[PDB]
Symmetry: D2
Subunit: 484 residues, 4 copies
C-alpha cells in the first residue's frame, strides 16, 4: 500500500532497501518504508550544512518564527490526516491522538517559535586596570546541523519536541524517526515542503539503529549535535559514537517510575490517577508508573479499587466507543512484555488482574494486545520491580514511613519521574523536593508546560530541554568581550 520515502535536500527519495510498517491492531501491512543508507545520510548532512549558508541563514528571527508558525498551520490544516497516521502506526485510541498527540506536536512548533521571538541574551560590564573598562556580551547563534533520533511511544510529539526548537534556533536538521512509527514524520516532511521550507533545512531519513541510518547519523562528522530520546543502553552507545567529535549531546532515556499514595490522599482520585499513569498508551510511555507504593493503612482498599477500575478498561479498536487501551507497538514488543509477565510469576508475584492476552474472536487476535496487569507480593529487589517493562503493568507495595518510602523510590538506577498523592500542604513540598528524579507531579500525572526544564537523572538522562534550556542547547552561546 502506502510508501514512505526519505526527504533529502528538498526532494523525496527512495532507497535500495525497504521495510514493513505494520498495524499492531491486526498485523496488517500499512506501508513500505525506504531505509536510507550511509550514502544518503551523507547527502542529508551535507545538504543541511549548505542550507545554513543559504536563504535559511539570512532569515531574521521574526521571519524564521513566522515560517515555523506556517509549519504548525500546515499540520493543523491536515489535522485528521496526522491523526490517522499516528493511529495507524501505533494503534493508539483516536481520542488520545486528537487531544494529546497531534495538538501537542503543533504546540511544540508554536511555542518554540514564540520563545525564539522573545529570547535575548546577556550584558556584563567590567572594570579594568586602566579605568576604561570593558563590555562583555553574549549572543545565540545556530549550533549547526542537529541530528535528531526519536522513539515510537509518542511519535510526532517527541519528534517535534526536538525538531521545533532546533529550527527555532536557526539550525538545520537531519531526523530519524523510529522504524515502528514512520508515518507522521513523513507527513511532517510534506508539510515542510508545502510551507516553502528551503531545501536541506529539514531532512528525513528512515531506518533502524545499528548498521542503519541511526548509527550512520551518529557517526557523521558533519553534525554539531545529537539529540536523542530512547532506551538508556542506546543513549550510552550514541554517547560513545559521538565522543571523537565531541558533539553536543542531549539524552532523554528510560525510567522505572514510582507513584506514591499517602494515607491522607484523596483515594478515589489517587486510584484514577495511578490507573491513568499505569495504563495510558497501554503503559508504553516513558513517564508511566510501573512501581506503586501505598500506605499500609489504605493498601488493601487501594488495590481493590484499582482492580475494579482496571477491569472496566476497554481494550480494543482505536475508534471503538469508550476505548481506553489499544495494542502494544508490535508482536516483538509483546513477546518481551509477556516474558516479563512470566518472570513476575516465577519471582512469586500475586497476579491481582490481567497477566495474559485478551481473546477477541476477530482480527484483533492477529494484533499485539495484552491485558492491563497488576502485581503484588514482589520484593524491592525483584527484576519486575527494577527493570523497565514498557507495558500496561504496575506492582503495588505497602509502606509505613515517609523517609522509608522516599528511600525506596530513590533506590533505583533510573530517575525520570514520580507522582505523589497527598492532600497535605507540607507533605507535598517536603516529600517532592526529596525525590531523586527530573519531574515530580503532586495529585496529577502527565501535565507538561513547554516552558519548564525537562530531563532525567542517573540513567534516565543527561542535560535539560524545555524553555530557556532548549534555547541554550540548540544554540552556540558566544561571548564577545570589547575592551573600551
Amino acid at each position: 500500500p502506502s510508501q514512505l520515502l526519505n526527504y533529502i535536500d528538498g526532494n523525496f527519495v527512495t532507497s535500495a532497501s525497504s521495510f514493513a510498517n505494520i498495524n499492531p491492531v491486526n498485523g496488517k501491512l500499512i506501508s513500505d518504508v525506504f531505509e536510507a543508507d550511509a550514502k544518503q545520510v551523507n547527502e542529508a548532512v551535507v545538504a543541511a550544512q549548505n542550507a545554513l549558508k543559504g536563504p535559511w541563514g539570512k532569515l531574521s528571527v521574526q521571519d524564521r518564527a513566522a515560517l515555523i508558525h506556517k509549519i504548525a498551520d500546515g499540520i493543523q490544516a491536515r489535522f485528521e490526516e496526522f491523526v490517522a497516521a499516528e493511529v495507524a502506526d501505533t494503534g493508539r485510541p483516536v481520542h488520545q491522538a486528537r487531544t494529546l498527540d497531534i495538538p501537542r506536536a503543533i504546540a511544540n512548533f508554536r511555542t518554540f517559535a514564540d520563545l525564539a521571538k522573545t529570547s535575548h541574551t546577556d550584558l556584563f560590564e567590567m572594570s579594568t586596570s586602566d579605568g576604561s573598562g570593558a563590555l562583555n556580551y553574549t549572543v545565540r547563534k545556530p549550533l549547526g546541523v542537529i541530528g535528531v533520533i526519536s522513539p515510537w511511544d509518542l511519535p510526532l510529539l517527541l519528534f517535534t519536541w526536538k525538531v521545533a526548537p532546533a529550527l527555532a534556533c536557526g539550525n538545520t536538521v537531519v531526523a530519524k524517526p523510529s522504524e515502528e512509527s514512520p508515518s507522521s514524520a513523513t507527513l511532517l516532511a510534506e508539510v515542510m515542503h508545502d510551507a516553502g521550507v528551503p531545501p536541506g533545512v529539514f531532512n528525513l531519513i528512515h531506518g533502524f539503529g545499528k548498521d542503519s541510518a541511526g548509527e550512520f547519523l551518529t557517526q557523521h562528522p558533519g553534525i554539531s549535535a545529537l539529540t536523542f530520546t530512547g532506551e538508556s543502553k542506546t543513549g550510552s552507545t550514541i554517547m560513545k559514537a559521538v565522543a571523537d567529535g565531541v558533539k553536543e549531546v542531549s539524552f532523554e532515556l528510560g525510567g522505572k517510575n514510582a507513584a506514591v499514595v499517602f494515607a491522607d490522599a484523596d483515594l478515589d482520585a489517587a486510584i484514577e490517577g495511578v490507573l491513568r499513569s499505569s495504563f495510558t498508551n497501554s503503559g508504553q510511555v516513558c513517564l508511566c508508573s510501573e512501581r506503586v507504593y501505598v500506605h499500609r493503612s489504605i493498601f488493601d482498599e487501594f488495590v481493590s479499587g484499582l482492580k475494579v477500575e482496571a477491569e472496566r478498561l476497554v481494550v480494543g479498536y482505536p475508534d471503538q466507543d469508550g476505548v481506553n487501551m489499544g495494542p502494544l507497538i508490535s508482536h516483538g514488543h509483546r513477546d518481551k512484555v509477556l516474558s516479563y509477565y512470566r518472570l513476575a510469576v516465577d519471582e512469586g508475584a500475586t497476579v491481582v488482574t490481567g497477566g495474559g492476552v485478551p481473546k477477541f474472536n476477530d482480527e484483533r487476535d492477529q494484533g499485539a494486545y495484552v491485558q492491563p496487569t497488576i502485581w503484588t507480593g514482589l520484593s524491592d529487589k525483584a527484576r519486575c520491580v527494577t527493570e523497565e517493562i514498557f507495558g500496561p503493568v504496575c506492582h503495588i507495595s505497602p509502606f509505613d514511613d515517609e523517609d522509608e518510602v522516599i528511600n525506596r523510590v530513590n533506590d533505583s538506577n533510573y530517575g525520570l519521574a514520580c507522582a505523589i498523592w497527598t492532600t497535605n500542604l507540607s507533605r507535598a513540598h517536603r516529600v517532592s523536593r526529596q525525590i531523586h528524579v527530573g519531574l515530580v507531579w503532586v495529585n496529577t500525572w502527565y501535565l507538561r508546560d513547554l516552558r519548564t526544564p525537562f530531563g532525567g537523572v542517573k540513567l534516565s538522562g543527561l542535560g535539560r530541554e524545555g524553555g530557556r534550556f532548549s534555547m541554550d542547547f540548540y544554540s552556540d552561546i558566544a561571548n564577545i568581550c570589547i575592551k573600551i
Copy 2:
C-alpha cells in the same frame, strides 16, 4: 618533601610515589603518592556519604560562609601558595602573585556569592478542570563531582571547577595534573583547617590512563565528570562515562587566531599579540599561535613583534624583570622542539627563536625554550593547524575581511579569538562571525566569572561560568502541583 592524598578527612600515603620536578633546573622537589583504584573508590564512597552528613544539612548561607572561609584560608597562606605554584611550573613570581593565586581565591568568593543570590522559576498553568496547576523548579546538589584538571593554570583551573561544585552543595573527588600537584595539596590543608567535613573534598594524585584519572572516570559512584585538558583525552573520558550517562562538561584544546586589521592601534596590537603568544611561555589554552595581519601593516607588525619578543627576559621566577619561565617539563619541551623542527621542514622562515637558550647555569638542566615567530607557512601546514602549546606564533598576511574570517574558522578547534580594530561596525560585524566561544576585541585574557565560558567543535562541550555553572553543578528538578 611529600605530597599526600586527602581522603575522607585524612592525608594518606599510597603504595607508589612519583617525582615532582622543578622545570627551572630539573631538580626534584617532592615525591607524590599515586592513588590506586581502591583509594579512588574510598574517595568516591566518602564523597557519597558526606552528602548525607552535616554538609548536606547546611543552609545555602552557611555553606557560602564556609566557602568564603576557604578563600580566607588561602589568603592567610598566600605566599605559600605562590611558592607552591612557582615551584611546580617555574612561572614568574610576579605572575603568580597577581594572576594565579588571587584568581583562585576569587573563584571561591564568586561562586559562593552566586550560590547565595541564585533562585529558580515559577510557572503557572491552566487545566481543563479550571483549577490550574503550579510548576516550580529547584536546584539540588548533583551528587559527587569528579574533577580532572590540567597543568597550565594549576590552582586557577582546579578551583574553577571545585568552587562551583562545592557552592552547589556537591562533594568532590579531584585529581590535579601529575605535573602540578603542590597547590592542590595545599588547598586540601586549607580545607581541613577550615573545618570542611570529611569526604566533602577529596584529593587524589596520579596520572591519566591506568591511574587515578582513569579510575575516577570509571567509577559509577560519581554523578558528573568535569574536565579540562586535551581534546583526545576529552573523547576518552566521554566514552568512559557513557555506560553511566554521567553529566559531562569539557573545556578542550584550541588553535586560536589573532587578527590585526589595518585600522588597529598598531603598537597596542603588537603588545597584545606579544602577550597572547608568549604569556606562560605560550602554555595557555587561550594563547594565539596563528596571527593574521593585514598586508598594509604586515611587515611593520612582524618587525615590531620581533623586537619586543627579543626584549623578553627568559629566566628565574624571582629574576628581576623576568617575563617567561620554562616549559612545564622536559617531555613537553621535546614535543615543542619537535614542532620547532617540523616548522622548518615545512618551509617556515624563523623570524626569531626556534631553539633553546644557553644559560650556562642550572637552567640548562631545566626545560626552557625560546619565544619563536614563524612566517611563510600555508594554512594547511601542520604547525599552523595542530596545537603546539609553546611560546610560538605563525604570522601571515590577509587582504579581505571575509577571507580572514574563513581562514580563522577553517579549523577543527574553536576556543577563542582576538581581533584588533578601531572601527565600530567592523568590531561587532566580524566578532559575531568567528566560530569560537570567546572573542576579545582590542585585548586578550579578560575573564569575568559571571560569563558563560566554553568552546565549540573539538574545543569542548557545554558551558560553565555564572548561572551555567550553577546549572551544571546542580540537579534541576521540576515539581508540578495540581490545584
Copy 3:
C-alpha cells in the same frame, strides 16, 4: 463624520461634541462626542466588573490568542487605519503605511507573545526548625488601567499602552488625544468585532482639564494611570492620583541632542540628523532639537544639512515624494511660530526656514511651517533649552569629548540622544555617559519592543518595554509557604 465613545460593549454618543480638524486644509473631518464625568464613571465601573467576567476566566493562552485576533482585525482593515491616522494628523501616507500602522499591530503581537512566554520566580529558604520555606511570586492583573495618550504618534503610542495592559489581563479605560481620535475609534470597532467582552476595553473621548482626561485621573476605581505627554501634564497627573497612591508610568517631554564627532561618516550623519530633526515635522518626542558638531566639520555639516533640508518636500500626505506634512493644529503652529520669533530675538542666525511656506492653495488654511535650522545661540537660550516640538534644530560646534558630554547632559530633560562616530571605543565610552534613557549610535528611531524604554529627570519616571511592561501592568504578589 462622527466618532462615538465605546463603553461596556456599546458605541455611545454624548451631550456635547467637538471638532476634529484636518491640519492639511483646515477642513472639518468629524464630530467627536466628548465623554462627561458620568460616562467616565460608567466606563471605569464597566472595566471593574469585566475583571469578574469571562475575561477574567481566560487562560493566558486564550487571552493571547484573542489579542492576536485584535491584531488580525487591524490588519484586515489596514488602509482604513492608514486613512484615519493621515486625516487627523496630515502625516505622509508612506510613513503611516510603513511605520504607524504596522508598529501598532506589532505592539499587540509582541505583548501577546511576551505574555505567553513570561514566568515568575521561586526562592527557597532555610528556617530555624530546619524544615524550610517556599517563596514563589505570581503576576496578577493590576486592575483597571487608565490610559491617556498624545497626538504625535496616535495609534502607535495608544497601542503601546493598551496592548501590554490587555496582555497582562487588565481591563482598560483609554482616552486618546483630542487632536487625533480617529484611529483609536477604529480600534474600538476592531475590538468589538473581534469579540472582546464588554467592559474590557473602553474608549472615552475628550480633553484634559475639566474633561474626560481629568475625570479618568480622579476616579478612585482605577488601579493605575499610564501616561505619555508634556512633562507639566505628568506632574499634574501625579498630584491627581497621589491620594489614591495609584501606580503611575510617565513618558514625558525631551530636548534631545544629536552629537557628531570628527570621525563620523559625515554624509550618513547629515542624513541622520535630517531625519531626527524633521520626521513628522519635528513632532516626535524622540526628535533632535539640539545638535552638536565637531568644530573641524561644523561648516561642512551645516552647509550639507541646509541643502538637504531645502530639498524636503512639504505638502499633501499622498503628494509625490512628500517628506513633511503640517503641524497637528493651528494652536500648535501659533506656539511653534512664537518660538521661531523668540530665536531671532535671542540672536539666532536662521540658516533656513524660520517661517510658513506659501502654497497659494487650500493648504494655506492648514497648519504648515518650514523646516528650520538655527546657529549662533548660547547654551542658555530658551530656544536651546525648551521643547519646541516643531521641525527645528539648533546646531553648535564643540572641540572636546568631555565638554560636549557635559553640554548634552546640562538639561532638565533626559529622553534620548544620538551619537555619530565610526570609532569603536568612542561609541561605547561616550554613550554610557549620556544621562538619558536611550542612546542611538549611527542611527535614529530604532525600537525593539523587548527593550526597556523611558526617560530620566523631567523626561519621565519608570520604564516600559519587555519585562518592564509585564511587571508594571501586573500585581507582583509573593506567596510564602512554611513547610
Copy 4:
C-alpha cells in the same frame, strides 16, 4: 547624650534641638539637632558632588567590599547598636539581638552580594540594510537618593533602603524618624570610621512637615525619594516630588488579616496569631489587626489566644521572660487608647486587656498598654478598618472560603496576609486570591531579601527587594548600536 547630623563627612549641630524620650520610663535619652533648610541643601549638594568623586570611580567589586566593611563595622559594635535600638524603642533586648540588628547587617551584605552578581541584557535586531543592530542595557547610579524612614523597626527599615541605594552606586541623604534617631546616628559613625567618602552618606535629623523631611522631598537636587510610613504621608510626598517627576517607592500602611481555616493546626495558628498580633506591641506594619476564624473552631481559638495573651510578660527590655515592651511614645499611646475607647463605644466585647498595666515603678511614667483582643464588631466598624498600630486584634468568625476571601479583600489597604490551613489545594487556591503584596501560609514575618516586597492599593506603590531594588536604585539605560 547628643545626636548630631552627618553632612559632607562631618558631624554637625543645628540651631534647634529636640528631645528623644525613653518610652520605658519617660526619661530623656538625648537631644537631637534638627536640620534646617540650609543644612538639607548642603547635604544634597554634597551627595551630588560625591557622585563625581572617588565613590563614583569605584569598581562594583570594590564598592561591594566597602559595603561589607560597613556591615563589619556594625558587627564590631553589635552591642552598642542593640542598646541604641532598645533605648529609643523599649523593645526586648533578645529581639533586638536576634532580629533587629542581625537583619540590618544582612541588608548591607545581601545587597552588596546582589550588586556583584547583577548584570543586564543584550538584544540583537535585524534592519532594512541587513547589517543589523545591537541593543544593550546598563545600570547606572540613579543619583541622589532621599530616604525617609519610620520608627517601626528603626535600623532595619533604614538600612533596607540605604544598603541597596549604596550598592547601586548612589549617594544618600537620609532622614530617620524623630522617634528613633539613635541607631542611625551610630551608623553614620560606622560609615565615617569605614572611610566612606564625604557626601556619600548624609544623615539629617528632624520631623516631616516644615522640617528636614519636607525639605528633603522639596529639594530639586535629588533623583528619587524612597519612603516607608503612613499612607497619608505617602500621598503628601508624592505631591511634593511631582513637579520634579522624581522616582518614588512607597511602602505605606496596612490593616492586615489573618485567616484560620477549620483544617489548620490550631495550636500553631494560635501561636502564630499571637506573634502576628503582639510582636513589638503590635507596632509592625506586618501585624494582623483583624483575624477571621472558621466558625467551627472560633470559640476554642479565642480561648487559647486569650490564655496565651495573658501569659505575655510586659515590662523591661532586659527583664527575664519579657515578651512586650511599651509603645514608642505617649502621643502614640493617646492615639491607641483612643481606639481602645472607640472600640467599646462601637460595641466590642473585650476578651482581654483594653487598658494600661500598673507597675508601681518608673514604668508607670513610660508608655505601656495591654495586649488587647476584641470580638463582636462588624466589618464596617472603624476599629476593624482603620490601622491602629498597637498590640490589638479583632477576631471574627466566617463560614465560606469565598466569603472570607471577599472580607479580607474588602479594604483600602493590601499589604500582607497570613493564612492557616493544612490543605494543599486550599493553601495555593486561597493565597493567589488575596489582594496583597505578601501572603504567608502557616507562618508570619518570614522575609527573604531576594523577593519582591510591597503593597497594593493604599499600602504602597512599586516593589523593592532582589532585582527590584537593583532596578529602582539604578538608571536603566538603553544603548543601540547600528552595525
